[PDB]
Each structure stands twice: as structure tokens, then as C-alpha cells.
Structure 1
């Protein structure tokens, strides 16, 4: 198993690491039919989504998607700084594949 979000992104096609290093500016959540998704944007202008569950996803991904949306909401509400985002750039807005957060009052 990968030990980094970067290492993890390297295993997929059409993924790309975006160094956010900032907290979420806006959180949008929809329960509208066929558009059950979450959209987050940063002051950098960057906009991402946790795309509507469908055929692009496998079964094990069902819970992961819900968890990802749970994470984005709590991250937004607690004003937690997001470090990097591994996203699929072949989707508009870019679909989130993985998220990493780092509390840096130290190093590594």
C-alpha cells in the first residue's frame, strides 16, 4: 500500500496532485436527483467535487465516497487546512480521489 497521497496518485491514470495548503472556502452539498454531490472551492479559485455515485465506481468505493463527503464537511466546518488533493482531472470540476491534511507545528 502507498504511504503517501502522492505515491497513491501515481498509481492512477488521469489523476493529478494539487497542493492546496489552505482551508475550504466554500462547501456546497446537493441532494437534488441525479446531482447528489459535494462541491468545494478554495480562494485560489480551484473547484473540486465528489462526483455523483455511478458506474465509474466499484462497490468498495460506495462507503469511501460517503466518507469523503463526510470528511469535506467536517474539514470545512472546523476550518481545517487541507494540504494536498489527488484528483481526476478528466472531470469538471476535478473529481476528488484522495485528500491529505497536515498539522505542521513540527515537520516529518
Structure 2
């Protein structure tokens, strides 16, 4: 099993690692129909999204998605340093697959 975010990311197609080593700059949350999502940006301008649960989402992935949004909201409020993001680059904003935080 992957021991870290980098090996984990290399296991999928259309994913790429982003090394930020910085806290989340802004956090956006929408409850709007068909746009139930979260968007975070960093000071340098990089924007990422936690993708809206569509048909392409099982039931085990639906829970991890809700988990990710909880993680991002609390990481933002506590000014936690996000180290890396593994994202799907075939989507705009890039969609978050994984996150790693290191104090």
C-alpha cells in the first residue's frame, strides 16, 4: 500500500502533485443545486476544488468526499500548513484527490 501522498498519486492517471507548504488562503463552500462543492486557494493564486458528487461516485467515495471538505474547512480555520496536494488535472479547477499536512 502507498506509504505517502506521492506514491499514492502516481497510482492514478491524470493526477499531479502540487507542493504548497503554505496555509489555505481562502475557503469557499456552496450548497447551491448541482454546485455542492468547496474551493480553496492559496496566496500564490492556485485554486483547487473538492468535486461535486456525481454519478462517477460510489458510496465509499461519497463519504471520503464529505470527509475531505471537513478536513479543508478545519485546516483553513486553524491555519494548518498543507504540504502537498495530489490533484486530477483533467478538471478545472484541479480536483483534489489527496492532501498531506506537515506542521
Could you say which structure has the larger radius of gyration? 1
Give structure 1 stretches of 5+ with no counterpart: 104-108
Match of 2:71 in 1: 71
Partner Cα distance (2:99, 2:78) in 1: 16
Give structure 2 stretches of 5+ with no counterpart: none
Partner Cα distance (1:46, 1:87) in 2: 12
Tell me how far 1:19 sits from its aligned partner.
Answer: 0.1
Match of 1:18 in 2: 18
* Deviation sequence 1:17-70 (CA, Å, 0-9, x none): 000110000000000000000000001110000010012222210110000000
Q: Which runs of structure 1 show a deviation greater than 6 angstroms over 4 or more consecutive aligned residues?
A: none
Helix, strand or coil: the match of 1:71? helix
TM-score, length of structure 1 as denominator length: 0.93
The CA RMSD measured in Å over matched residues stands at 0.6
How many residue pairs are counted as aligned between the two chains? 103
TM-score, length of structure 2 as denominator length: 0.98
Helix, strand or coil: the match of 2:57? coil
